[PDB]
Amino acid sequence: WLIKEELEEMLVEKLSDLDYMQFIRLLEKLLTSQCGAAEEEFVQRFRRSVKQLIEPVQYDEQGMAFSKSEGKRKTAKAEAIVYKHGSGRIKVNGIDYQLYFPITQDREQLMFPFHFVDRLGKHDVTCTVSGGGRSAQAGAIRLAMAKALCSFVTEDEVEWMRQAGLLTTDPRVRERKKPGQEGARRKFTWKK
């Protein structure tokens, strides 16, 4: 249903909570009363409705197919090109992934999407990352790789990844320090 403010704007009138409840309950009864098309059309005037984009598969000069995508985490940005076919090589900033990320946690982050879709060793990846710390860079590269792999994995696989969280951009970012308190929430030691 449209919210009470929506209904108030529709009726250019000022209602109350109980008025909205009465209207909504009457509408619900109208639904339950086998509302036909002639009535469902009127009802839908008060209803309110509540997928990852598949990037094009481009081709190189040699005709090898690939998909390019991008993603940002904290302050890091990553552009990932994933090839339709590959032996699992993942070169980051022209560097091998294991060398560039000396932390097995970051390696696991890189592996997460391809492991999830069971496509490890089936794609060669080139990831250019910039900015932020090591974990932010790992997250950005993971997001970019997942998005690029979407184009190559089936739609059901894409939906599964999105449900898992691979394909959802992280909204968690550092919260700015506030004046008069040490941290974003750390209130200075309460004097007495």
Binding site: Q22, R25, L26, K29
Partner: protein, 85 residues
């Protein structure tokens, strides 16, 4: 000077002495004997007894009227037959 065991006697059924005792106590309360015993443990002065009896009668009648009114008006609790208006 009366016969024994004829007054306030209940025969236990199948040995459920608990149930028989509960029935006997219910009988005593219904006839008010427990009221009399616990009230006669001490002496209520006639003025206090009169006040208490008047208060009890007033409360009984008030409760009867309130219950009758509630029963009479309960029928209107049915779901609204003109909802939306």
């Amino acid at each position: 000077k009366h016969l024994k065991f004829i007054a306030r006697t209940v025969m236990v059924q199948e040995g459920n002495v608990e149930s028989a005792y509960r029935t006997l106590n219910r009988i005593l309360t219904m006839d008010g004997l427990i009221e009399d015993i616990k009230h006669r443990r001490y002496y209520e002065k006639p003025c206090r007894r009169r006040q208490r009896e008047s208060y009890e009668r007033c409360r009984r009648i008030y409760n009867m009227e309130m219950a009758r009114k509630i029963n009479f008006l309960m029928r209107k609790n049915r779901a609204d037959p003109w909802q939306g208006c």
